[PDB]
Structure formats: structure tokens, C-alpha cells
Amino acid sequence: LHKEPATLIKAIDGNTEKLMYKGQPMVFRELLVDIPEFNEKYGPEAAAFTKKMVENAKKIEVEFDKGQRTDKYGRGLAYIYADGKMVNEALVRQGLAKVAYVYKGNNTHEQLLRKAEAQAKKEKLNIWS
Numbered sequence: 001l002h003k004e005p006a007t008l009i010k011a012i013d014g015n016t017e018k019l020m021y022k023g024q025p026m027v028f029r030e031l032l033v034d035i036p037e038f039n040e041k042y043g044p045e046a047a048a049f050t051k052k053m054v055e056n057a058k059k060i061e062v063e064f065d066k067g068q069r070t071d072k073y074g075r076g077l078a079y080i081y082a083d084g085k086m087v088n089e090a091l092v093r094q095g096l097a098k099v100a101y102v103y104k105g106n107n108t109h110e111q112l113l114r115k116a117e118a119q120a121k122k123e124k125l126n127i128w129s
């Protein structure tokens, strides 16, 4: 796998809906996680943690896995990094997302993320409280 550059695109409301990848706006869906929606418990917290992590970062990178790069809704499927720290792993490690959607061939970081989830669960953090 290899990391590639992207930048945040700031939406009219001040948040990031899309990343600019090879100079095109794209919604990216994080690989291997289920993140609660805003209306669900921990949803506001997951969103706020993501916003701080990506906005504070000097460098955003995306990393496609070995399988499908876009899903059925046209979203890019990747691991997202903020100054070299994976956003997908960080949400899981904080109990702000669960490991999920593990499909054949896009599963490279599965064990790493399950390791993070077990720690968040052992620590009874957030979703696991």
C-alpha cells in the first residue's frame, strides 16, 4: 500500500465533506469502520474528534487498499492519515467507531484495527461504556 496526498475541502458550513484527490473533489468513506451518524449516540463526538484530527493536521494522505477503490455510492474507500496517524485506527482506538464492513481484498489493516478495538473495549471507552 502507499499513501497519496490529498487536501481538505472546506464546505459552505465550515466542515470538510470532501477531500481533494488528484485535484478532484471526492467524498471518502473510511475503510473497515462503522462510525455512528450524528443522530446516534457518540455521533457528535465521533464527528468532533474527526474534525479536530484532520483540521489540526499539516498533512492529509489517503491510502487505497488492494481491492475496490470506490463504493456503490461513488465514495472513495481508503485509509485516511493525518500527519501519519490513521484516522480509521484513531476513531476505533477511542471507541468512536467499530470495526465493520470487512470485505475480501480490502482488509489489509483489519488486524491492526481489531487490536485497537479490543483496547478501547477493555478500557470501556465511549461506545464500549
Ligand SMILES: Cc1cn([C@H]2C[C@H](OP(=O)(O)O)[C@@H](COP(=O)(O)O)O2)c(=O)[nH]c1=O
Residues within 6 Å of the ligand: 029, 030, 031, 032, 033, 034, 035, 071, 072, 077, 101, 103, 106
Ligand atoms: C465501508 C464500506 C461501506 N460500503 C457500503 C456498504 C453500505 O451499503 P448500504 O448503504 O446498502 O447499507 C454502506 C455503509 O456506509 P455508511 O456506514 O456510510 O452508511 O456503504 C461499501 O460498499 N464498502 C465499504 O468498504
